Symmetry: C2
Subunit: 244 residues, 2 copies
């Protein structure tokens, strides 16, 4: 499984700041064994694709579940493609929790993004109350079951596991905690799909990943990379890309 | 009050289709006495601004309430400005009723858009049940009251009244239904702000405006323009810009 690092810029950037990230990502040096994608704000898809080296993929941070229609403020997968970009991040914690997007909607978006030809990073993960209530596994398995009916091409999926309590808080999951879930998810793929899919699908970890803690997480046998927020905006992002 | 016509493309378009809209807007003829704005999908702000003649304003179809932050999938007024665009549509029915945005949030959005120096089209409007139940006025007055604390510059606001029942359904409001609401809203401005703001603030009508019906609507004393959805995607739009 090729190591995979996504940088989620969330609601951060302007042309000048994006030039800056591009500049330090160019210089790197970036490991050629890491597959790298950056998720830029909805309004910078085209710009970021034009300016970023073709070896780095570009992701929209959200999209809707049909190609066009009466959805003021939304963009479709066809539009992401038209902007020259190949990826979309879907069901991010911030969309599930700040903006109330339910599992059903996320599944439908993932379905439509795949139909449209995009590669998708579906996001899953339990809340603090789930973690403390020893229901982490049941919660993430349920999120996976909700996505299953719409995952129509596993070769174009990279699953991101992000404990809600770990996002933006500095409270990153320990390598042991993350490895445990990733292994559960990988067997979930064997039991619900097949072994080929389980053995080839990247499962990445996100939740306060830093240059300081990334090596110890990457070591773990079922952690295939990272989804990175705050650290993606700074030059340290290079070390995370190079965590192996 | 200068006649104002906005075209809301919603989730429609790609570069080629936007090229087509621009081509027919260039041909015109467009009245110098109509202030025209188009609202494009989030990912086309920079592209539309670059190719659409600059006598035409560009609006974002949505934005969030802070300049940057942990809000995957959102864009800020600072980004809209960076993309070369001056307008944003806020509180559109489709955001209220498909994506459940509450009045408080919309008001905070308007507040921040104005602070960051954008021009804003706040949308208000009653549901069929409100209209049948004889409570249109109470509904649109509450909506205005919700906005009021955050309207920090009336000179950069155009209010859009769009009966929810009239959007995309072809069920256009009669010139009388629309005028009655517009006259009430204007009186609301006199009572809650002042006479100068009441006389100078554009109040525009939206909800299935066509080339066929725009003249009768435009003829009304308190109807200062339109917010146009479906008809904005077709050359028909020119005749609506010229409705007065």
């Amino acid at each position: 499984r090729k190591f995979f690092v996504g940088g989620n810029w969330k609601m951060n950037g302007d042309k000048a700041a994006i030039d800056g990230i591009i500049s330090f990502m160019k210089t790197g040096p970036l490991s050629p064994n890491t597959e790298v994608v950056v998720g830029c704000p909805q309004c910078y898809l085209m710009y970021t694709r034009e300016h970023m080296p073709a070896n780095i993929g570009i992701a929209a941070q959200n999209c809707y579940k049909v190609a066009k229609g009466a959805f003021t403020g939304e963009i479709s997968p066809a539009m992401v493609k038209d902007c020259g970009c190949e990826w979309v991040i879907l069901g991010h914690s911030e969309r599930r929790n700040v903006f109330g997007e339910p599992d059903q909607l996320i599944s439908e978006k993932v379905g439509h993004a795949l139909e449209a030809g995009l590669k998708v990073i579906p996001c899953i993960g339990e809340k603090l109350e789930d973690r403390e209530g020893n229901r982490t596994q049941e919660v993430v398995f349920a999120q996976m079951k909700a996505l299953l009916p719409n995952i129509s091409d596993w070769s174009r999926v990279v699953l991101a596991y992000e404990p809600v309590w770990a996002i933006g808080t500095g409270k990153t999951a320990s390598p042991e905690q993350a490895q445990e879930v990733h292994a559960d998810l990988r067997q979930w793929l064997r039991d619900n799909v097949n072994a080929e899919v389980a053995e080839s699908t990247r499962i990445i970890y996100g939740g306060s990943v830093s240059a300081g803690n990334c090596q110890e997480l990457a070591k773990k046998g079922d952690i295939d990379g990272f989804l990175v927020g705050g650290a993606a905006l700074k030059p340290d992002f290079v070390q995370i890309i190079n965590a192996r």
